[PDB]
Amino acid sequence: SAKVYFHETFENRDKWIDSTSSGKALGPFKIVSGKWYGDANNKGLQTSEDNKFYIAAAKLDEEFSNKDKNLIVQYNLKFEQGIDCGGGYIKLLPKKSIESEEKFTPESEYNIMFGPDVCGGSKRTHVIMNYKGKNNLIRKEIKCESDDISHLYTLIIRPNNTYVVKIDGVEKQEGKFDEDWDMLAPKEIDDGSGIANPDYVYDPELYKYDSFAYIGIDVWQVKAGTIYDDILITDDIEEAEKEAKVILERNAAEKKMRDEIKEAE
Amino acid sequence: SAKVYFHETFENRDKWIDSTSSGKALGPFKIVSGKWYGDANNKGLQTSEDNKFYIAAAKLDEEFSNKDKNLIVQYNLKFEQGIDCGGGYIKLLPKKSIESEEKFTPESEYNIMFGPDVCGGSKRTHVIMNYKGKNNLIRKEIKCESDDISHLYTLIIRPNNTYVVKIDGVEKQEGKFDEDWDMLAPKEIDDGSGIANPDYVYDPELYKYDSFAYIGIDVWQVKAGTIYDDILITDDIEEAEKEAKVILERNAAEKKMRDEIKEAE
Ligand SMILES: [Ca+2]
Ligand SMILES: [Ca+2]
Ligand SMILES: [Cl-]
Ligand SMILES: [Cl-]
């Protein structure tokens, strides 16, 4: 029944290859239990060195397309350090984008970039959708969390051509891809065009991507310490909302350990 | 006292020159009373032919800077035709970018693009801010009216680095340039970057423009018939709300005349 295309728990970091094709100046990930957590046997991937880029990619369990199917993207992310400026997002890439993991690059083509990103007064949850060569921003602010405990970001994409974004299981945006992005106005940014243009024609498949093949992380960090806890990708709505209560139960536990180290101070 | 840099009432259209430099097929503007109106002596600028572009520009009474200064743009716009797809908006341009009005084009550099824009399910009020050579979208949806009577779009930009948007005098958005735009991540749309990057630094003057000189209209119309009624630009908030209240009765009258024509149908 349910198909899970990916579920990383970071017991290890074996599927994840650091880019050897960026021009950086990259930092190292470490698999670390965290200063506080809901399960001592559990485990996550952490950026470990300040003011550096972090770029790594991993192949998914199976190449797939979400055409005429659901798709849920859902991963748990912790800004343990008290983030000041740094990304916590992920990208998902088609097979055609990268000949293999080490060649993943910021300029690498992605289908979707999703997740928290914090710098100064900007705290938002990306939902960038790639369409016909352009990356399109969500058009609809979705703030992201900024404290030091893990939160669960969920993206939900139905073939109805609509989406849903939840954080910690509570829906925070819902709308239809043609109404909430300007994907069908490609020259609005560069060419001073409006949304109303010729070539604005409704696309039943703004939700569809032919190929999902890699997941990738490419964040800048000034204060390192961001931790990717768990990552899940699947086509089954109940399966994703079956694994989340596990994770949010453990984040609750994580919170109670959290506040006891802050009175040890 | 109050400085009014521009107040067009469209008794005529003389100050407005149709672009001879866009590469596009233009339609003709006509000065019209409208199918319904609040004063038969007042006219507006109307797009008159389906599936054409409408591109013209006009010089303001004075070149100015809003540095250390308030600034309000407030114009009345009516989609009398029952719009399906069309702008909408206006642009404000510095004294460069165009040697004179006829050379205005969508690709011309502008300071601000503001106003309604409707196409299919996309109905929003633009507040595009030009920064660093790139046009930045407001990142926070602001819906726009889409019926067939006139509505008064008002944007005010204070040297505090904040804005607000009203429609028919009712404030519908409020915020700070550094939080509700992503102006300080110019390479996020292209380049596949995040907001958090090494070149994010706060700018107190995201509100300031060295040169305000031209105003322009360059909208696409599927169903033509949009009327630009009145345009006001000024550095004084009172006087802007003073001139607002006259225009908003004229819309009330325009409103009573309208439901009075469709009871005949
Ligand atoms: Ca885990
Ligand atoms: Ca008028
Ligand atoms: Cl986004
Ligand atoms: Cl906008």
Numbering used by the authors:
A (entry chain B), B (entry chain A): 14 to 207, 289 to 359
Publication excerpt:
Calreticulin (CRT) is a 46 kDa soluble multifunctional protein that was initially identified as an endoplasmic reticulum (ER) chaperone for monoglycosylated proteins and is also involved in Ca2+ regulation. Similar to its ER membrane homologue calnexin (CNX) ectodomain, CRT is composed of a globular domain, into which a flexible arm-like P (proline-rich) domain is inserted. The globular domain is made up of seven concave and six convex β-sheets forming a legume lectin fold. We have investigated the CRTs of two distinct parasites, Trypanosoma cruzi (TcCRT) and Entamoeba histolytica (EhCRT), for which a pathogenic role has been proposed.
E. histolytica is the causative agent of amoebiasis, a disease mainly characterized by dysentery that leads to about 100 000 deaths per year. During this process, EhCRT is exported from the ER to the phagolysosomal cupule, where it favours the phagocytosis process in a way similar to that described for human CRT on the surface of macrophages during the clearance of apoptotic cells. A similar EhCRT construct was then produced and beautiful crystals were obtained.
